[PDB]
Amino acid sequence: MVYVCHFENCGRSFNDRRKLNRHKKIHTR
Ligand SMILES: [Zn+2]
């Protein structure tokens, strides 16, 4: 349904897992 990348500085809301599974790159390496 909805997914909120409320990381230790982020806060991005998304309406599918694919948007989060691609946003995760902004928190990779
Ligand atoms: Zn995030």
SSE map:
Blueprint: E1 3-5, E2 12-14, H1 17-23
The structure holds zinc ion (ZN).
Residues 5, 7, 10, 12, 23, 27 line the site of zinc ion.
What does this structure look like?
The chain is of the alpha+beta class and 29 residues long. It has one domain. It is 24% helix and 21% strand. It has one helix at residues 17-23; strands at 3-5, 12-14. The protein has a two-stranded antiparallel ribbon with strand order 1-2. It is flat. The termini are far apart. The structure holds zinc ion. Residues 5, 7, 10, 12, 23, 27 line the site of zinc ion. The PDB classes it as rna binding protein. The entry lists the keywords beta beta alpha, rreiib-TR, RNA binding protein. It forms a monomeric assembly. The entry is titled "Solution structures and characterization of HIV RRE IIB RNA targeting zinc finger proteins". The protein: ZNF29G29R.
Structural class: alpha+beta
Domain module tally:
1
What is the CA-atom radius of gyration, in angstroms? 9 Å
Bound molecules: zinc ion
The 3D shape can be described as flat
Order of helix and strand elements from N to C terminus: EEH
| Tally of DSSP β-strands | 2
> Quick one: biggest sheet?
2 strands, antiparallel
Number of helices: 1
Distance between the termini: 27 Å
Strand order of the largest sheet: 1-2
> What fraction of the residues are assigned to beta strands by DSSP?
15-25%
Helix content: 10-25%
